[PDB]
Design a protein around this ligand. Sequence first.
Ligand SMILES: C[C@H](O)[C@H](O)[C@H](O)[C@@H](O)C(=O)O
Length: 310
Amino acid sequence: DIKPRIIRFGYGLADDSPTGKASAHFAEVVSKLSDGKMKVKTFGNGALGPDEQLINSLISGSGEITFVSTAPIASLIPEFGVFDLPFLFDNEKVADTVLDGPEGKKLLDKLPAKGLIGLNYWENGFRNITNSRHEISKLDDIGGIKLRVMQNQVALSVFKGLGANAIPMPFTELFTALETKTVDGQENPLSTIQTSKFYEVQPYLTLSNHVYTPFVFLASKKWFDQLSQDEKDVITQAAADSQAFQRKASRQGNEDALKYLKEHNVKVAEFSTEEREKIREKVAPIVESLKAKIGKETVEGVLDAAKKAS
Ligand SMILES: C[C@H](O)[C@H](O)[C@H](O)[C@@H](O)C(=O)O
C-alpha cells in the first residue's frame, strides 16, 4: 500500500556536508524501498529556512522531513536544552549509547505532543570555537568575545558565564555575520566549519569540543499520520539505515575536516590540560543554575546514562 508521493526535506547545512550527503542517502533509500514511488526532494543550505522555520513547517505541514539541532527544540520542549551543557559526553560512543537508549527515547517521546515525530537521532557533533579577533588558547581569551550561539537560554547562559558576549543567531545568517565582523566568532563541528566555509572568514580555530550536539531526524506528525503503514515503514526503515550511514559519514568527515583545516594552514589552537579544568569550575555553578530550566530528572538521567556508558 504505497501511493506516489513527493516529500520535501529542507535543512540548514551545506549539501556536501556529511549530513547533507546522508539526506541524499535517505532520499535514495526511500526511493528503493518504495519502487521509486516515494521521492524525497532535498533543499539544502537553508533554502527552506533555518532550523526554527523548518520546525514550524513540519508543525504546520508545509514540510515533511528535516534534521535540526536539539537547541532550537528547547523553545518547544525545554528538556532538549540538556545537550547544550558542556562536557556531557566524553565521546561519540557514549553519545550513541545514551541517545539511542532510554534517556534519548524519553526526550523523543515528547515530540508528538508538539506535532513532530522524532524518527531517531543523527550526529551534529562536538563543537569547536572559531573567531577572527585573537587566538583562544585560554578560558581568559573568551572574555568579551562576540560569539554567536544557538538560540536557547542554555547556550546563551553557558557562554555568557564563560565571559563571552553571546549573540543568539540563526545558522542561516552566520556566514555573513562572520564575514562582516558583526560577530567575532562562532562554534560548530569541524566538518561544518569546513563545508559552510567559516574558515574563510575565521583565521582562528580552537579545538575545544566543549558541547556535543545531537541532531533530531524529524517528520511532520500531521503528515506522517496520514501515511499508510507500508508508507511509514518506508520512512522508519529509511531513517534507520540513514542514521548508520549518517554517523559514519559524520565521523569520517570530522577526520577529513581536521586534515583539511590543518593542511589549509588554519591557525589551530587547543585548550591546555588545565585551561580545560579552568573551564569546568567556571560552568559547574551556572550548569547547576540551569538544571531548573531544563528539568532535573532529564539532566540527572542523562548524566547517569552518560556515566554508565563510559
Ligand atoms: C541548521 C544546522 O543544520 C544546525 O542546526 C546548525 O548548524 C547548528 O550547529 C547551529 O550552529 O545552529
